[PDB]
């Protein structure tokens, strides 16, 4: 559980640079918000160590929440006077995505290369595809830490992405 320490070291280091150089206020808000969420991760996941996969899921949860908020603001309008609340959510996703890609894990492209053969087999060995559950049963959800170098959430979302493409109906 040292990569998490290395990954968290950069996040705190960037905050000092942001404050010292008077960098983007939004980036300061992003980093300070991640450390708040990371504080919960320390408390909740105590005695279970802190691997990068739980950090990846922590950052992934933040990204989707802001995307969900942005998807509503860009449709119904922003509440602030300058109508910048919707765009602020998108700009904060870029900062978190920057730290998300810095983690020592495999990208979605590699996982898509390691999941599509499973997805294709299910369609070929059953004729038709109706749910991602039939794909989940053939996924080894115990050895995806160094072979695929992916997390539980990373694999779960990737299978949904391929299932929507490969769904017959």
């Amino acid at each position: 559980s040292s990569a998490y320490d290395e990954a968290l070291a950069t996040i705190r280091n960037d905050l000092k640079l942001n404050f010292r150089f008077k960098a983007d206020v939004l980036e300061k808000n992003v980093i300070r918000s991640i450390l708040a969420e990371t504080k919960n991760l320390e408390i909740d996941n105590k005695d279970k160590d802190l691997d990068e996969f739980k950090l990846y899921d922590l950052l992934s949860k933040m990204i989707k929440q802001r995307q969900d908020s942005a998807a509503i603001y860009l449709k119904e309008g922003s509440p602030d006077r300058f109508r910048q609340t919707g765009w602020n959510e998108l700009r904060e996703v870029d900062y978190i995505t920057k730290y998300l890609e810095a983690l020592p894990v495999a990208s979605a492209e590699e996982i898509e290369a390691k999941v599509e053969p499973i997805v294709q087999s299910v369609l070929e060995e059953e004729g038709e595809l109706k749910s991602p559950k039939e794909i989940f049963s053939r996924i080894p959800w115990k050895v995806v830490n160094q072979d695929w170098q992916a997390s539980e959430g990373a694999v779960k979302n990737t299978v949904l992405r391929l299932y929507n493409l490969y769904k017959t109906d």
Binding site: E112, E116, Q120, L123, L162, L165, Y166, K167, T168
Partner: peptide, 28 residues
């Protein structure tokens, strides 16, 4: 029995275009 013609790719990723197994409609 039947087999696909040559130069038919096994995989493709054209964005969000649906991905279906290549089928020769002549053999239906």
């Amino acid at each position: 029995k039947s087999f696909l013609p040559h130069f038919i790719p096994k995989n493709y990723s054209y964005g969000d275009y649906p991905r279906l197994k290549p089928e020769n409609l002549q053999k239906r």
